[PDB]
Amino acid sequence: HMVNPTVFFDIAVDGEPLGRVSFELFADKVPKTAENFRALSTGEKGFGYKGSCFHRIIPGFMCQGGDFTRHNGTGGKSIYGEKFEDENFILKHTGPGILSMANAGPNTNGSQFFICTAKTEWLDGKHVVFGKVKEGMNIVEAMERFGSRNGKTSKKITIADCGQL
Ligand SMILES: C[C@@H]1NC(=O)[C@H](C2CCC2)OC(=O)C(C)(C)/C=C/c2ccc3ccc(nc3c2)[C@@H](C)NC(=O)[C@@H]2CCCN(N2)C1=O
């Protein structure tokens, strides 16, 4: 029987440790999308999220990250190539904690992702939901306080370490 993977991010604020956020990845529903995020979190392909930042945090909306090639929301790449397809839209944006793929149009998933801090149902069926925060929503809420209405962060929010549990 297969068990959904768990991954962790250790978050830092201007280089100062903040806490750990862990995620369940719904490999049972979106295996290809789950596997991308899993492998980018372990670094096992030779690239991934360790050291990258959350480039846009909008309080009461979402925290977005995963651009480890241009560091500002314009870059990123998947373990399958520069981009990969939308797998399915089985799972919906039901509330805070949902983990979902950022994109630039149909079938443009790469490495960027977002963590919901509110229900974002208008994104259903165009962003692939593939996971959820398991532990450490308090740390996501602490990260959120460094966001702003236009998404610029007031301190640098980084993934100091990440991997699989
Ligand atoms: C739609 C967005 N896509 C990207 O960020 C992709 C990247 C390349 C693959 C992912 O970047 C692009 O398309 C370009 C480089 C053209 C930048 C767009 C951009 C810039 C600043 C924004 C400021 C604010 C907003 N949207 C913004 C969107 C508000 C309204 N929405 C969001 O913050 C949503 C939340 C769900 C995740 N999420 N952002 C995305 O998936």
Pull the structure tokens for residue 69: 């090639």
Resolution of the experimental model in angstroms, please? 1.8
Integer Cα distance of 81 and 65 in angstroms: 18
- The CA distance from 82 to 76, in Å, is 7
In three-state secondary structure terms, 155 is: coil
Using the 8-state DSSP alphabet, how is residue 33 labeled? H
Q: Which two tokens stand for residue 64?
A: 């977005």
Q: Is 115 helix (H, G, I), strand (E, B) or coil?
A: strand
Q: Is 74 touching ligand 1 by the criterion CB < 6 Å?
A: yes
User: What number of other Cβ atoms are within 10 A of residue 9's Cβ?
Assistant: 27
> Residue 57 is which amino acid?
I
Residue with the smallest CA separation from ligand 1 atom 20 is 73
Cα–Cα distance for residue pair 108/12, rounded to 1 Å: 29
Instruction: Identify the bridge partners of residue 164 per DSSP, sorted by sequence position.
Output: 7
Q: How far apart are CA 100 and CA 132, in angstroms?
A: 8
Number of domains observed in the structure of the chain: 1
Q: How was this structure determined?
A: X-ray
Task: Please report, for the domain that includes residue 108, its CATH number.
Answer: 2.40.100.10
**For the CA of 114, the nearest atom of ligand 1:** 37
Q: Which of 53, 61, 64 to mutate to test the pocket of ligand 1 (most atoms within 8 A of CB)?
A: 64
Cβ of 110 closer than 6 Å to ligand 1, yes or no, is yes
Estimate to the nearest angstrom the gap between the alpha carbon of 23 and the chain centroid: 9
Q: What spacing in Å lies between the alpha carbon of 103 and ligand 1's midpoint?
A: 7
- Cα–Cα distance for residue pair 156/143, rounded to 1 Å: 10
| Residue 164 backbone class (left: φ over 0; alpha: ψ -120 to 50; beta: rest) | beta
Distances (CA, A) of 108 to 3, 43, 62, 72, 76: 27, 21, 19, 17, 11
Q: Which domain does 127 fall in, by range? A: 1-165
CA distance 82 to 58: 26
3-class SS of residue 16: strand
What whole-number distance in Å separates Cα of residue 11 and Cα of residue 51?
A: 10
